[PDB]
Amino acid sequence: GSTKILIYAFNYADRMLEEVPYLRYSAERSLCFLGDLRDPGTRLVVITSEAVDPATLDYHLRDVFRFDEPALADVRRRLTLLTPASRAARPLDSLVLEDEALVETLRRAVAERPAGTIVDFSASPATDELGRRTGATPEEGDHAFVARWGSKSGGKEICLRAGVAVPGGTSEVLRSEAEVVEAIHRLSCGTAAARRAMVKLDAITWAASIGNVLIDRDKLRHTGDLVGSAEVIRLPAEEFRRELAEQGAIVEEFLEEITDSPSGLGHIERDGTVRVVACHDQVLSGGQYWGCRFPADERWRPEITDAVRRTGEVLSGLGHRGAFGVDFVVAGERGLLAVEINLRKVGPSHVVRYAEALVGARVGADGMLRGADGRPVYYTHGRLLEPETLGKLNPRTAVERLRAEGLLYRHDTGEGVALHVLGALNACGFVELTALARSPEAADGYSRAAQALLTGPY
Numbered sequence: 001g002s003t004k005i006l007i008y009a010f011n012y013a014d015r016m017l018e019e020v021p022y023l024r025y026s027a028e029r030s031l032c033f034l035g036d037l038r039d040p041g042t043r044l045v046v047i048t049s050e051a052v053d054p055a056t057l058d059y060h061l062r063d064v065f066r067f068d069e070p071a072l073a074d075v076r077r078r079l080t081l082l083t084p085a086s087r088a089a090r091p092l093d094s095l096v097l098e099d100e101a102l103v104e105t106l107r108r109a110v111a112e113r114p115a116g117t118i119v120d121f122s123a124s125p126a127t128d129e130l131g132r133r134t135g136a137t138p139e140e141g142d143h144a145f146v147a148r149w150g151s152k153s154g155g156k157e158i159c160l161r162a163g164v165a166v167p168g169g170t171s172e173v174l175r176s177e178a179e180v181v182e183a184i185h186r187l188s189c190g191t192a193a194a195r196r197a198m199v200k201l202d203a204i205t206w207a208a209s210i211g212n213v214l215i216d217r218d219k220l221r222h223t224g225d226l227v228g229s230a231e232v233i234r235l236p237a238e239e240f241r242r243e244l245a246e247q248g249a250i251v252e253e254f255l256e257e258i259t260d261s262p263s264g265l266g267h268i269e270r271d272g273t274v275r276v277v278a279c280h281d282q283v284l285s286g287g288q289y290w291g292c293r294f295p296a297d298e299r300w301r302p303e304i305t306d307a308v309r310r311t312g313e314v315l316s317g318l319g320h321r322g323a324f325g326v327d328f329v330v331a332g333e334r335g336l337l338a339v340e341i342n343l344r345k346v347g348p349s350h351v352v353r354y355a356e357a358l359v360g361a362r363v364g365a366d367g368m369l370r371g372a373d374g375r376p377v378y379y380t381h382g383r384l385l386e387p388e389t390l391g392k393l394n395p396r397t398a399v400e401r402l403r404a405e406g407l408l409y410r411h412d413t414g415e416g417v418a419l420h421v422l423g424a425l426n427a428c429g430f431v432e433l434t435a436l437a438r439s440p441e442a443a444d445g446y447s448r449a450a451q452a453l454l455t456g457p458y
């Protein structure tokens with residue numbers, strides 16, 4: 001007997017939730033986990049800031065996970081969908097916590113079963129609290145540890161230990177502007193049209209590209225002040241300063257010529273067993289990761305895998321259980337350098353789950369997914385937001401459109417298109433789409449077709 005409780009709240013996004021609006025519908029991502037209901041024992045609870053739409057659920061059941069009609073009723077019986085009483089735009093976990101009754105219910109559910117697991121994006125105070133107060137152990141909670149080691153500096157240190165190539169820099173916090181300046185002027189330079197330095201605020205709260213601040217050294221050498229020579233600062237200066245004071249930053253060289261930005265995804269079992277889950281080729285694309293592709297490029301896939309494994313081992317030693325992410329850059333002829341470490345699930349993870357479900361099989365060998373017949377599988381995954389055109393659709397409508405023009409993934413052919421986060425369609429005009437084909441080009445084409453279908457009238 002298992003009980004699993006799904007709260008895929010984006011907690012590390014304190015600002016973005018109040019900006020990018022389709023975020024409230026983020027939790028829907030968790031619907032990739034329904035595969036678990038294949039075990040007669042597993043019981044799932046889904047929590048979203050906004051109610052999952054019956055249509056979406058139906059799609060997932062039939063056209064995604066391909067449940068046989070006999071068992072389907074049973075599967076449905078072992079699934080519950082719940083919404084916090086708060087409809088304020090805040091991290092989902094927090095909202096859940098605030099609803100005492102909901103928490104109580106969750107606890108009761110957990111008790112009812114042998115085993116409790118909480119399924120989350122990043123480990124957070126709120127998630128930890130929930131775990132404590134419900135008797136479910138977060139699958140990816142461990143807040144203090146995360147704080148310690150998912151930080152920029154910590155990540156860098158881990159990378160170094162692993163023997164994974166990092167960009168030239170220290171792994172040392174810089175609690176003052178002077179320190180930062182010193183760090184900047186003590187670097188690797190290297191021939192660069194516009195030689196640059198980058199200061200990355202150490203906290204994990206600042207994940208991705210809000211913390212990272214970039215200064216061209218020329219400007220500095222003339223004017224002593226950090227925020228006088230900032231070529232890219234996305235923080236209110238004052239706030240940045242405060243962060244520096246209180247949490248600080250770490251100093252890394254800005255690699256100029258970037259061709260690809262691959263990603264590596266790792267899982268530690270509780271017995272330390274590290275698994276290379278997958279490798280993709282993310283495309284920062286303004287950092288909003290408007291998507292990604294699988295598998296990674298043939299050249300650096302194998303290389304990446306080994307690196308990931310090493311990192312995983314290191315993390316296990318350190319004592320991290322759950323899931324880790326390594327973000328990379330490819331720097332002209334200089335090669336491949338690990339830039340980020342993430343102590344949390346990452347975008348690709350959820351996509352990968354869905355992909356696996358579609359295929360019917362797990363990632364495969366040590367790398368590269370393959371269908372029943374053994375033939376390789378390639379997917380393209382994109383976030384698309386078009387208030388204008390998509391805001392006209394509802395989940396059901398979209399699904400039927402996909403079915404009509406034979407765009408929807410069919411299991412008999414082994415190629416097509418599956419959507420995610422369908423609830424955002426009507427409300428924010430947002431959707432994820434993933435496209436699977438026999439060749440990557442084919443997959444891309446399919447994706448394009450889908451886009452065309454959905455972002456036009458009819």
Ligand SMILES: Nc1ncnc2[nH]cnc12
Nearest residue numbers: 167198252253254255339
């Ligand atoms: N050193 C670096 N140069 C350029 N972009 C980066 N993103 C993260 N680290 C970077």
